[PDB]
Design a protein around this ligand. Sequence first.
Ligand SMILES: O=C(NCc1cccs1)c1ccc2nccnc2c1
Ligand SMILES: [Mg+2]
Ligand SMILES: [Zn+2]
Length: 313
Amino acid sequence: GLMQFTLPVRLCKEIELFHFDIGPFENMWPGIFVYMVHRSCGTSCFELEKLCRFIMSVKKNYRRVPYHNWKHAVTVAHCMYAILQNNHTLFTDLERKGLLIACLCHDLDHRGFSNSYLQKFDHPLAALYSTSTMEQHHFSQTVSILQLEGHNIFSTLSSSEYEQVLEIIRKAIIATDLALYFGNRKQLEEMYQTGSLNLNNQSHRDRVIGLMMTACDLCSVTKLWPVTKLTANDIYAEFWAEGDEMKKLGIQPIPMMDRDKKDEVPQGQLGFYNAVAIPCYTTLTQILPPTEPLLKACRDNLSQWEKVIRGEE
Ligand SMILES: O=C(NCc1cccs1)c1ccc2nccnc2c1
Ligand SMILES: [Mg+2]
Ligand SMILES: [Zn+2]
C-alpha cells in the first residue's frame, strides 16, 4: 500500500512532458510504467505483485525487432500518460486503467511486418483475421497474458467493469491499425466542425480514444529532433527488412520499404507528416486542447525534415 515508485529528479520532471524519452536503460522501463500507472490511476488500481508479473510477461512477448519492441510499448504508454495527466477530468477511472494497459500491449508479439506483408505471405494470422490482422493478434495475446495464473490485474473489478475494460482495450488496440485512422479522423473532424461531437456519447468517446491511440502510437514524430531522427532509423530498419521479404515473394515493394531507395526517405517523411501526423495531432488538439505540445513538436520535426531535403542537414 505505502510502496511508491520514485524516479530520479530529472526523470521525475521530464516524464510529465510529452517529449520525454524513456532512455536506454531497459531495467528502468517497468519502474517508469508503474510510476505512470500510480500517478495516472492511483497506488490502488492494481495489486503490485500482479502488475509486476503482468509487465514482465508482456515484456517477454515483445520480440527483438528494430522498432516494434518493448521500448516502443513503454514509449506509447508514456505518451498516453502525458495525455491523461493533461486531461485529468475528461476520462473515467476505467479508461485511465484500460488505456495505459492497452498501450503497453498494443504491439504484443509484433514480428516487424505490416498487415500487407502477412496477406501477401499468406501467413496463418491472415486466415484467422482478414482485417487489422496484427492488431487482432495483439489483442488476442493481451487476453492470453491476462489469463495466466497470477496475471489478472483486473481481478478486483466487478463482472461489468471487467467486460467494459476489455472492450476499451480491444477497441484501443484495433484503433492502432493505421488503415482505420483515416476514416476515424475524418469522422472526428466533421463531428467537431459541424459541432455534433459529444463526449457523453460512447460511439464518440470510442472514436476520440482511437485518435489518442494513433497519436500515442506515432509519438516518435513528436519528440525532440535527435530522438525523432534516430527512431526513424529503427522504423526504416523494419520497412527495409519487409521490402527485402517482399522481393523474396517476387514483389517489388513500395519505395518507402525499398532499401535501394534510401534517397527518397526525406520526401516520404514529408508526405507522412502531411498525410498522417499533422492532421492526427491537429484534430487531437481541437478535441483536447492541452495536447497542443504534440502538434507543436510535430510541426517542428516536419521543418527539420524540410531542412534535411534542402541539404542543410
Ligand atoms: O506507416 C507508415 N507509412 C505507411 C502508411 C502510412 C499511412 C497509412 S499506411 C509510416 C511512415 C513513416 C513513419 N515515420 C515515423 C513514424 N511512423 C511512420 C509510419
Ligand atoms: Mg501496431
Ligand atoms: Zn505501435
